[PDB]
Design a protein around this ligand. Sequence first.
Ligand SMILES: [Zn+2]
Ligand SMILES: [Zn+2]
Ligand SMILES: [Zn+2]
Lengths: 206, 206, 206
Amino acid sequence: NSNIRENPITPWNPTPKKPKIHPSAYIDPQASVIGEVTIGENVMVSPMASIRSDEGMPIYVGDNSNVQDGVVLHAARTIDENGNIIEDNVVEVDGEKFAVYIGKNVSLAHQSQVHGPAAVGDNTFIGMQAFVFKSRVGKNCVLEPRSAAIGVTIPDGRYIPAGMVVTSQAEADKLPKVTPDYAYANLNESVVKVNIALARGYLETS
Amino acid sequence: NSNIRENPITPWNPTPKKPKIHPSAYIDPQASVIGEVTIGENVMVSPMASIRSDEGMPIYVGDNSNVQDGVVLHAARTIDENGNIIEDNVVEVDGEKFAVYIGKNVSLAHQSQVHGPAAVGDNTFIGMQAFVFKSRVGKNCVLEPRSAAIGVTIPDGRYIPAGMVVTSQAEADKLPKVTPDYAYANLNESVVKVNIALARGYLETS
Amino acid sequence: NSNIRENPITPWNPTPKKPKIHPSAYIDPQASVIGEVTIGENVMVSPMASIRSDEGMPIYVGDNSNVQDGVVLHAARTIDENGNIIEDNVVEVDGEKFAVYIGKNVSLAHQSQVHGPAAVGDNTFIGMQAFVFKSRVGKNCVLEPRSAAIGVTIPDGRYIPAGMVVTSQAEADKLPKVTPDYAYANLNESVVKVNIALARGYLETS
Ligand SMILES: [Zn+2]
Ligand SMILES: [Zn+2]
Ligand SMILES: [Zn+2]
């Protein structure tokens, strides 16, 4: 398992940290997982995904989420030169601090990127080639393909239309709501089911 | 050839499928090809490309096409829980059904993505970081870098300007036409020649 | 070091060229470096980056720069079928000719792409998922995430706002100036420090 590796000693990280990966998660041989990473149950990590917890850490990927081809997870440093926490570079979730927090039943679709500090709430679809950076995406959200959230909080239950780059909180507060007739309303549930089954199938051949 | 692999058994796929790759195609050691995939003659598949036919299948890449660095091919499931074909998730081309169909002399340039259901017609350039999803791109087309086609049919012989995200069929019908003086008019022919020669050169060292 | 490779013989390249990589640079095992490439001191090349100098060449990455996850460097051919240099496909920097020139203290952030012909000047941040193609980016510049420069020269000391695709020189000449109170004004210095330290740390475990 050359592709699952400790992070190196740095001025902000004095001991190597090794990923904690649940046995029901599947890491593709050509995915890469480095450093202080926790990956939950049934998580499918596809080829060419890179989860790199060597600058900002920790990075958490919750149960039944998926990390698809070419997705990148990385984060800005959380420890100062003085050794003090950089509060603006961490996100608090359930009373704990993370560089990147991915909740449960989250899909990170092909070539998307979540860059810390960032959190993605449960049951949220992050669409293909989408981008999340210095942002909190609520639960039950849909980032359509090529959308982006930079420096904002996306309210629970909203979607970002394809191609839209949201940098203003006033715009984020105004985003349209997911409804039963919205075209992507049931997509994440489908994608999560598929990827749980892919992880199970790939593990049976391992 | 650890990087050329069968897909796993899943509820929608009861037997493993293995890629069919012509001997004149070159698969980079750090490209990944999984599942029910057919790759034609002289196809150059560059490092970090991921062709993954494990959800929707089959994926077809025609003769003399190229799949460049970091390109992703994947597709939505084509078989229901009941085992019935999901017709909206397949494309018909020449009387056959595909999850993703890439025609002949097609360039999929660096970091682009074609996500099924989708078809790309012959002699079409899909530019760097471009995106094709639930769409039919005609033949002799040019998707400039960062362009996207989502949920539309691109008429033969049109181009999408750089950065434009086309989601409306009315907009797709109005796209500008490739002409001899268009800046990208002869690019695909050049890129196809280069990649055929790269595949030949890389195979001679293999 | 299977991932550091010569380029193949082609009609435009009659002898194989091998990368020249300084001993203080770190190449991730799942990065790929092919062909006529020069990589300077302390350069961190992250997982899934592909530096491919097999069509246009040479590709140069200067001292203390970094090439992050999923970044692609490639270039259009520089030699004609007749064997004459294609002048429009090379960039001159300090009296020398390159397919891609990356200066010193440059960050190529996750999933960005620089496609030759192109030059990036010293101390410039190329943001996540950004794109540089047939362009000269000045020194002390910031391309925010999802920005792009195609067919233009970016003056020294300017930034491109997130998501903006610059294709017109008149627009490039008008881009806003980096100032001490600009949000990204000090980012590149920070990122360069981090990546120098990452390269040192990763090499100590190698
Ligand atoms: Zn980063
Ligand atoms: Zn997919
Ligand atoms: Zn190229």
